[PDB]
Amino acid sequence: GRLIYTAGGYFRQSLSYLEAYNPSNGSWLRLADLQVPRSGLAGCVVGGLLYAVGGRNNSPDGNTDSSALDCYNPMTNQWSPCASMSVPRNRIGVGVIDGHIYAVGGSHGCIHHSSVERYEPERDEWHLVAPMLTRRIGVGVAVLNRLLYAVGGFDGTNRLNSAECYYPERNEWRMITPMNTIRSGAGVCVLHNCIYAAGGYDGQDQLNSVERYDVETETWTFVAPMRHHRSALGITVHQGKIYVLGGYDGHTFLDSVECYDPDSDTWSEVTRMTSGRSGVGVAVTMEPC
Numbered sequence: 001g002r003l004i005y006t007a008g009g010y011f012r013q014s015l016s017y018l019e020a021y022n023p024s025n026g027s028w029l030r031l032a033d034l035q036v037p038r039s040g041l042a043g044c045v046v047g048g049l050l051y052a053v054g055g056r057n058n059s060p061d062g063n064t065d066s067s068a069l070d071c072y073n074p075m076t077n078q079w080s081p082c083a084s085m086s087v088p089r090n091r092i093g094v095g096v097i098d099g100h101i102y103a104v105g106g107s108h109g110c111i112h113h114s115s116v117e118r119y120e121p122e123r124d125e126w127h128l129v130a131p132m133l134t135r136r137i138g139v140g141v142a143v144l145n146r147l148l149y150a151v152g153g154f155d156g157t158n159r160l161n162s163a164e165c166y167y168p169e170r171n172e173w174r175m176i177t178p179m180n181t182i183r184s185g186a187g188v189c190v191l192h193n194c195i196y197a198a199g200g201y202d203g204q205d206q207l208n209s210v211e212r213y214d215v216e217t218e219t220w221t222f223v224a225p226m227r228h229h230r231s232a233l234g235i236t237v238h239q240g241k242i243y244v245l246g247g248y249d250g251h252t253f254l255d256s257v258e259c260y261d262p263d264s265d266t267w268s269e270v271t272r273m274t275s276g277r278s279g280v281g282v283a284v285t286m287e288p289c
């Protein structure tokens with residue numbers, strides 16, 4: 001569609017914000033709050049509905065990992081509960097294939113999931129599928145050519161440079177070439193024939209580096225670094241450009257939104273979020289009403 005939606009996030013505590021940015025005019029619009037605050041969630045879109053998946057409510061009243069799937073209809077500006085996942089998944093990644101949502105990895109307390117499940121909107125049902133070969137929280141996920149990729153994250157002990165691919169017709173995961181950089185909480189998306197991994201945390205520092213995996217050549221190549229180091233950034237693609245939203249730079253919860261032009265191999269600032277935050281869910285769909 002036409003707007004970049006950012007849902008939830010973290011600053012001091014987990015947030016309920018839903019706001020939409022319009023690249024055509026620079027404008028932000030505040031929309032209906034999530035029913036439950038959450039950070040470390042993912043967003044995605046199916047049939048012009050926006051979905052918020054997993055996360056955790058870090059609050060003064062306590063900390064609750066989320067198994068929730070919630071449905072936002074832009075035509076009505078209302079959130080509806082959808083069926084919950086088998087398990088809470090904080091710092092989750094999601095991918096959409098053929099109108100179905102895959103929920104990948106994430107944590108529940110000290111449990112670091114390798115498990116994966118798939119939601120079918122027409123049935124309002126989740127079903128488990130084959131688990132990843134590695135436990136991954138803070139995992140990045142993207143879809144290219146109807147294959148699902150899980151990239152980086154943290155396995156409970158080490159931050160990971162590894163990545164793997166799920167072949168739905170085989171219900172099977174296989175390792176791909178590892179990244180050149182260890183990354184937990186990177187932004188992962190697809191542009192053209194490449195899976196991009198932007199930023200994240202290597203166990204030491206927040207990263208500004210960006211690298212991309214060419215599915216044909218099976219190699220990762222660095223492109224230009226972002227203007228800001230960031231972990232727990234939101235990422236999405238809007239009209240052939242990658243947008244990265246917020247995150248944490250080791251000092252500040254960023255309001256910076258940056259945009260990547262792959263033809264010039266340059267990042268630039270495009271706007272600021274209305275407030276700095278990390279761990280947001282991001283997706284693109286039609287403008288409301």
Ligand SMILES: Cc1cc2oc(C)nc2c(=O)o1
Nearest residue numbers: 138184185201206231232248
């Ligand atoms: C994902 C992640 C973990 C983390 O732990 C610490 C101590 N800092 C960070 C960060 O920026 O990002």
